[PDB]
Design a protein around this ligand. Structure first.
Ligand SMILES: [K+]
Ligand SMILES: [K+]
Ligand SMILES: [K+]
Ligand SMILES: [K+]
Ligand SMILES: [K+]
Ligand SMILES: [K+]
Ligand SMILES: [K+]
Ligand SMILES: [K+]
Ligand SMILES: [K+]
Ligand SMILES: [K+]
Ligand SMILES: [K+]
Ligand SMILES: [K+]
Ligand SMILES: [K+]
Ligand SMILES: [Mg+2]
Ligand SMILES: [Mg+2]
Ligand SMILES: [Mg+2]
Ligand SMILES: [Mg+2]
Ligand SMILES: [Mg+2]
Ligand SMILES: [Mg+2]
Ligand SMILES: [Mg+2]
Ligand SMILES: [Mg+2]
Ligand SMILES: [Mg+2]
Ligand SMILES: [Mg+2]
Ligand SMILES: [Mg+2]
Ligand SMILES: [Mg+2]
Ligand SMILES: [Mg+2]
Ligand SMILES: [Mg+2]
Ligand SMILES: [Mg+2]
Ligand SMILES: [Mg+2]
Ligand SMILES: [Mg+2]
Ligand SMILES: [Mg+2]
Ligand SMILES: [Mg+2]
Ligand SMILES: [Mg+2]
Ligand SMILES: [Mg+2]
Ligand SMILES: [Mg+2]
Ligand SMILES: [Mg+2]
Ligand SMILES: [Mg+2]
Ligand SMILES: [Mg+2]
Ligand SMILES: [Mg+2]
Ligand SMILES: [Mg+2]
Ligand SMILES: [Mg+2]
Ligand SMILES: [Mg+2]
Ligand SMILES: [Mg+2]
Ligand SMILES: [Mg+2]
Ligand SMILES: [Mg+2]
Ligand SMILES: [Mg+2]
Ligand SMILES: [Mg+2]
Ligand SMILES: [Mg+2]
Ligand SMILES: [Mg+2]
Ligand SMILES: [Mg+2]
Ligand SMILES: [Mg+2]
Ligand SMILES: [Mg+2]
Ligand SMILES: [Mg+2]
Ligand SMILES: [Mg+2]
Ligand SMILES: [Mg+2]
Length: 249
RNA sequence: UCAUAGGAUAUGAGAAGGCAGACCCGGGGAACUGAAACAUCUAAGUACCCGGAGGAAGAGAAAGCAAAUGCGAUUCCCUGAGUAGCGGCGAGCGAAACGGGAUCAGCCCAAACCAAGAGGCUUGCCUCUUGGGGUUGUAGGACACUCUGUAGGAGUUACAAA
RNA sequence: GUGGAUCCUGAGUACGGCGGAACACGUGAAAUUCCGUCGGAAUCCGGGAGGACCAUCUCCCAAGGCUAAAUACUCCCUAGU
RNA sequence: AAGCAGAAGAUGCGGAGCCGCAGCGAAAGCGAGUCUGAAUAGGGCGCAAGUACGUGGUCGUAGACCCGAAACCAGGUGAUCUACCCAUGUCCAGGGUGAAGUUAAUGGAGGCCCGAACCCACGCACGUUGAAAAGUGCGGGGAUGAGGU
RNA sequence: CGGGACCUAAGCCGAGGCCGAAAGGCGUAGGCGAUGGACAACAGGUUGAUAUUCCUGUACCACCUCCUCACCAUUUGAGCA
RNA sequence: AGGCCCAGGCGACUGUUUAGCAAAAACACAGGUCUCUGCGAAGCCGUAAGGCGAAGUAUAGGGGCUGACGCCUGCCCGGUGCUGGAAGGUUAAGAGGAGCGCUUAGCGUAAGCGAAGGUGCGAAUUGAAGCCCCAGUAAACGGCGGCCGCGGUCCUAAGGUAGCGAAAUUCCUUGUCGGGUAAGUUCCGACCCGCACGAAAGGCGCAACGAUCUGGGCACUGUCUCAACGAGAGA
RNA sequence: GAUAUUGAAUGUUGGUAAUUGACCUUCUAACCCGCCGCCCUUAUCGGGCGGGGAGACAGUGUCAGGUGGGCAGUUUGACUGGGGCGGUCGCCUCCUAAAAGGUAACGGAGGCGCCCAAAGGUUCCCUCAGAAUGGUUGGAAAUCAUUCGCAGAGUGUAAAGGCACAAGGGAGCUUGACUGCGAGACCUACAAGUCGAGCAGGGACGAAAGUCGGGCUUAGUGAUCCGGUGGUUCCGCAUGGA
RNA sequence: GGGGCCUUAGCUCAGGGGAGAGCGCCUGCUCGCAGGAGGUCAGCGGUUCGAUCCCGCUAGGCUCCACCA
C-alpha cells in the first residue's frame, strides 16, 4: 500500500506482481524464478522483496536483463537453477554481418517477449544470446534469419560464453539537465525538453525532473545520444564548476 | 452469610499552640560575589524556608586506629598543618591518625534453647504472644557437665522502677 | 570453669551494576559513607577492614537499641567587673 | 600550646609541638657534600645565628580607608488603584428615523440618528515652586450598548 | 426601620477523603457568605441636642395560657405534620 | 440648538488602546481560510490531586494567518517546517562475553611459565524513536533571474500571472505631460526606467462610516495688513 | 527504548545440557476506568461490594537516546586621530633611525609558518655573468673554440650584511643534522632567545695538520595544564605485587 | 568612497610548459555532413627559462556596505 509513492505510476504494475512473488515464497516455502527482469525491475524487486532472500543471475556477470530467484533462508541457488540456455549464433560471417539491432529485431520478430531473453553478447569471435530454458527450443527452431543473414543456433554451456569514450569535462551543477547538456553537447533548453518529455533515464528509471541530482556512477540513457555514465566527480574547479568524467557506450 | 467498614457511648493532666531573633539535629536550598570575562569550580551546604528537639543536642562502647616487646567507646581543646592531598592542578578548597590535655562508664537486646499459654492442627508439626535464657572475636552463647548464689551487691543519669 | 555432637550469633541485608550525594578528596588509580533504581551473598571450613585490585599477614565481628561527663548557647534571674 | 593551680592577674607547672643547628636530589638515598653524568671530568645547588616576645613598616585572609550603583537571589506583603473575570443590584431627560411582520395604513427593528444626565478625553488656551504630583475653561466623542456604575 | 436569633449566589472554609520532599494543595458531607429572596406601624406632636425608636391616637405580627366561650375527638381516632 | 461643499490616501462599519506627551492608518470586529482535536478530546493551569475546555462532543472546541462587501487570489515542493513512508545507511541504555591485563596454588638452577578463584577492562552479535534517505504539502516558513540579438544562450526549485504603479512603497525627483493658481517641491489625473508594488505578513475596487490624514472651494472672520479702545483678574 | 511493578497458557523460532531466551496470539488474576447497580449515606468526593470495559498493555519509578529559545545561566576581543565598518594582531629583512645600541605612527617596502638524506660533514680540485670573433642543423638566444672579462654571476627562499686565500661550481668517502656538557659572553622586566673556546665518550673525512654538535648569516614558530608513546638502579599508603 | 567578485575567439565557455571545445560565420554539400575563419587571454609592469595561468597595480562592469548624531 505505502510502497508505490517511492516508485513511478507505471512501475506500480510490476510492484503488484513483485509482491505476489513474495506472497508465494513466504507461505508455500519454495523458490520462485522470474522471467528476465529489466535492470530497473532488478532495483524495484530488491526493494519490494525487502532484505524472502533474493538472488539474481543473467548467465554471465554484467548482464543487463537478469532472472531473479526469490529463495528463503535455506536453499541457496545454483547457476543452473536460473534455467538459462546460451546459444552461439552461426551465420556466414565472411559474407554477412549480424548487428545487435538486427538480432534483437529478429528475436522480437519470432514473437519472443523481452522478458524471455537476457543479454546479446557480441565478441570479436562470436555472437551469443542467453534465453530462458523454457523458450530455448522455440528460439532455436524459429530464429532462422537476423537482418539479411540466415542464422542458426548452436546450444553451448554458460562457461563457453565469449564475454569506452573517456571525456573529462566540467558542469555548473549535478542536475540532470546540466549533466545531459554537457554529455550530449547541447543547449540546456534543448536538454530540458529531453528530460521533461521523458527520454532521459538514470539507471533505467525515466527521470522527468530536470533538477534531479545525479550521483557518481549513474548510467544515463539519453534517447538520441544513446547511453553514458558519470563515472567520477572530482570536486569543483576554479570559478565553481564540478569536474566530471563521462564514458559513452 | 459470618463478618468487616461504618455508627454510638465511656475513660484519658493524650496531642494541638507559643517562644530565646541563641545553641542542636534533620528535610529542602539560592544568588550576588571570587575566578580580575565565564560555564566546571567558588560563594556554601552559607542565607533563607520547613520539620524535630533538648537543656543541651549530636556522637558513643570497634566489622575502629594502626603497623609497636602496640592502642583500647564517644565528644571537646592544643598540636599535627596551611602539611598530605584535592583543584578549568586555575581561583581556591584542605584533612586525619600518632603525640599532649579536659572528662571518663559502660550496658540492654535479636537468635539458639527452655517453660507456660494461645490458635492453625500444616495434625506431635508450624506460627504467634508472655516469662526465663543469652550477649561475643588469639570467638561467645545455646547445649551438656560439674560448680556456685538466691540476699551481700546494685539502683531510678544508661545499666529495672516507684 | 571445663567440653567441642549438633544448633544460634541481626537478609531483600552486606555487596554489585546504573544514576546522584557525602567524605578535605571535583570520577579520578578512588578505597570509605549515604540515597533512588535494578540485581543480590556467605552465614564460623563464615564475614569485614587496612585508600583501585589480588595474595599473605594484622586488626576486627556490620546489617538491633540505650548511655552521664568534658562541649555549644543566653530571652532570663542574682552578684559583680 | 592546650591544660592544671592562681584576682577574669602576675606567676608556677605543663616539652606534646614549633623554628634553628646541613645540605643536595623528583625520589631511593647519600651527606660537607650532593645531583647530573660512563666520568677522580665539567657544571648546578651547598659547605668552606638562631629563636621567643614587644614596638614600628608592609603584605595575606577577613567589608579591610570611608561613602555610592544599576542589578541578582531568597522568603514574605499587595487586585481598597488599575487589567480581565465571576455573582448580584442599579442607571440611561427628551426628540427623530421607521426594518421584519401584519392588513397606503399599521407595526416598532437597530453595536440606528440628534441630544442632557453619565462615561470618555479630539483641539486650543491657561496652569507648569499649580487651586490640582494630570486639573480648569471653551469647544469635542459615545450616549439601548462590544454601554455606564 | 437597617442587620442578627430566616434564606441562599459568586466565592470562601471544609469532618472523613484525594494528592504532595516538608510547609501544604485540592475537595465531599456540612457550613459561612448580600450586592438578591423573605419578613408585622402608621399619622401627628415634641427637645438646645433622638425620633417609623419618645409622647398622643389608631394598628399590626409571632409566640404563650392562670382564664372564658364554641366546636370536634380519645386507636378509620380528633388534630398536628 | 448642525457650518457647508468638491476631491483623494488609509481603515469597511459601532467599538478598543499607550491611567499621566501617541486615539491612529494600530487592536478588535463580522466574514474568509488553514490546522489540530473521537472525548479521561485537543489546548491550557497545576509536581500531583483537582480543574478550565464543557455539564460542550467535529454545524463542537483550541491554535495560526487574513479581516465587511464585490471581483479575484497566478508560478515554484530544491531548501526549511509539517504529514506520511519503501529499500539502503547510521545510532543509547540494557542484553551478551570472544579475548586480554593484575593477582598466585603449583612449577621451575634462575629468567620465566602458570590451574582455580577473585578482580580490572572488554570485541563480535543484539538494540527504539530520531536522523540521513524517499513521497506529498505554499490562505505552511519562504521564493518568484541574468546576458545577448519575439528568438538565442546561461542559470534556477521556479523566474512576478491578473490587477495596480513617482504609490503611507520612487533614491535619482520639484521625473514628464495635463488639471487647478497671477504664481502650486504639496494636491488631482495620466504616463511607466516599479532604486526597491503584487495577490489572505492578501491584490484591486468599494456605498456607508471617521475629533483619521491630504488638496481645493463657498461662507466667515483681529489669523493677518496693523493695530486701537473698552470690561474684569493679577501686576 | 530497556528495566521494575509483571502473571498464566498455546504456537513458532534461537542458544546452551531438558532448562532458559526471542517473538506471535490467547487468557485473567495484578494494574487502570472522568462506566453501571448496591451500601457506607440526606453525598456528581472517597471507600467497600457486585457487574462491565480494558489488561500484563497502560500508568508510575529507575536508566537511556532523540527533540527541545518553551525556559535558564552566560559569551559575543583589542588596536583605532570618537565609535561602528574596513584593515591589523606572532616571527624575519630593509628604510624612516638624526655615522654605537635603542627608538614611534592605521609611516614606506617585502618575506615566514619551510625546504634539502644533500642543498649536511670532510677531503681534493675548480671559477662566474655577458660580450666579441668563427661555426651544418642553429635563429637574438642550445652546443663548441678562442680572446676579453672583479664579479657586471651564483649563494634552496624576502631583504640586508657578507662571500672569488670563496661562503659560489665539481667529484670521492661519509652521517658531527653526534651523546654528556660547558670557562665566559651577548641580549633581556620576566619567561625566553643567541654565541662559545674547551673537556670526556664514540665517530666521519684527511697522509697529517686539522675540520665537523646541520645548511653564508639572520624567519620557518607556541608557555603551562592535561593526555599518548618509548625508556628507567626512582616511589609504591600493613607486607609482596599491582 | 570602502571591501568582494568578474573581464578568453562575433557569442557562450576549457585551461607555470606555450589557447581549445561548441556555436556563429565560411567553404561544397545532398540539412545534416566533411573541413577552415575567429585570440593585444580587459589594460599595464615584473616574478620567472616559461605567465591565460603566479604577483602588484589600472580601467570597466556586477554585488554588498556608506552607520550614531
Ligand atoms: K555564580
Ligand atoms: K572580576
Ligand atoms: K570515590
Ligand atoms: K545501589
Ligand atoms: K580492626
Ligand atoms: K660539585
Ligand atoms: K636576638
Ligand atoms: K609586624
Ligand atoms: K587593610
Ligand atoms: K492598539
Ligand atoms: K497651501
Ligand atoms: K580627530
Ligand atoms: K661532498
Ligand atoms: Mg567573575
Ligand atoms: Mg536531655
Ligand atoms: Mg525540656
Ligand atoms: Mg543524646
Ligand atoms: Mg532508667
Ligand atoms: Mg551483630
Ligand atoms: Mg593497602
Ligand atoms: Mg535570574
Ligand atoms: Mg493576597
Ligand atoms: Mg479583594
Ligand atoms: Mg447609537
Ligand atoms: Mg459618578
Ligand atoms: Mg480610557
Ligand atoms: Mg449623541
Ligand atoms: Mg430585615
Ligand atoms: Mg478546600
Ligand atoms: Mg482534614
Ligand atoms: Mg441586602
Ligand atoms: Mg418590613
Ligand atoms: Mg438633628
Ligand atoms: Mg476604523
Ligand atoms: Mg497618553
Ligand atoms: Mg491624547
Ligand atoms: Mg486530569
Ligand atoms: Mg469539568
Ligand atoms: Mg491585518
Ligand atoms: Mg499565494
Ligand atoms: Mg521534496
Ligand atoms: Mg491657497
Ligand atoms: Mg506589500
Ligand atoms: Mg501572502
Ligand atoms: Mg488589508
Ligand atoms: Mg469610532
Ligand atoms: Mg536567553
Ligand atoms: Mg552570575
Ligand atoms: Mg575598542
Ligand atoms: Mg575611525
Ligand atoms: Mg572589522
Ligand atoms: Mg646616533
Ligand atoms: Mg644606530
Ligand atoms: Mg589550565
Ligand atoms: Mg603496598
Amino acid at each position: 500500500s505505502d510502497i508505490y509513492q517511492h516508485f513511478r505510476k507505471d512501475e506500480r504494475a510490476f510492484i503488484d506482481q513483485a509482491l505476489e512473488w513474495k506472497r508465494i515464497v513466504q507461505e508455500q516455502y519454495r523458490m520462485k524464478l522470474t522471467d528476465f527482469l529489466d535492470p530497473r525491475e532488478q532495483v524495484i524487486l530488491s526493494a519490494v522483496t525487502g532484505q524472502v532472500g533474493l538472488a539474481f543471475s543473467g548467465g554471465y556477470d554484467r548482464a543487463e536483463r537478469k532472472r531473479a530467484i526469490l529463495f528463503p533462508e535455506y536453499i541457496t541457488p545454483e547457476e543452473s537453477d536460473f534455467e538459462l540456455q546460451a546459444f552461439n549464433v552461426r551465420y556466414a560471417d565472411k559474407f554477412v554481418s549480424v548487428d545487435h539491432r538486427s538480432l534483437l529485431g529478429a528475436l522480437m520478430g519470432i514473437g519472443l517477449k523481452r522478458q524471455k531473453f537476457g543479454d546479446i553478447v557480441f565478441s570479436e569471435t562470436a555472437v551469443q544470446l542467453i534465453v530462458s530454458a523454457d523458450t530455448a527450443d522455440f528460439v532455436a527452431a524459429q530464429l532462422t534469419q537476423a537482418g539479411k543473414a540466415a542464422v542458426s543456433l548452436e546450444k553451448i554451456d554458460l562457461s563457453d560464453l565469449n564475454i569506452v569514450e573517456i571525456r573529462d569535462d566540467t558542469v555548473s551543477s549535478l542536475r540532470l539537465d546540466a549533466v545531459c547538456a554537457s554529455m550530449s553537447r547541447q543547449s540546456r533548453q534543448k536538454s530540458q525538453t529531453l528530460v521533461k518529455n521523458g527520454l532521459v533515464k538514470v539507471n533505467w528509471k525515466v527521470v522527468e525532473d530536470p533538477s534531479y541530482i545525479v550521483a557518481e556512477g549513474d548510467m544515463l540513457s539519453i534517447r538520441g545520444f544513446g547511453r553514458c555514465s558519470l563515472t567520477k566527480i572530482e570536486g569543483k574547479t576554479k570559478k565553481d564548476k564540478w569536474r566530471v568524467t563521462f564514458e559513452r557506450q
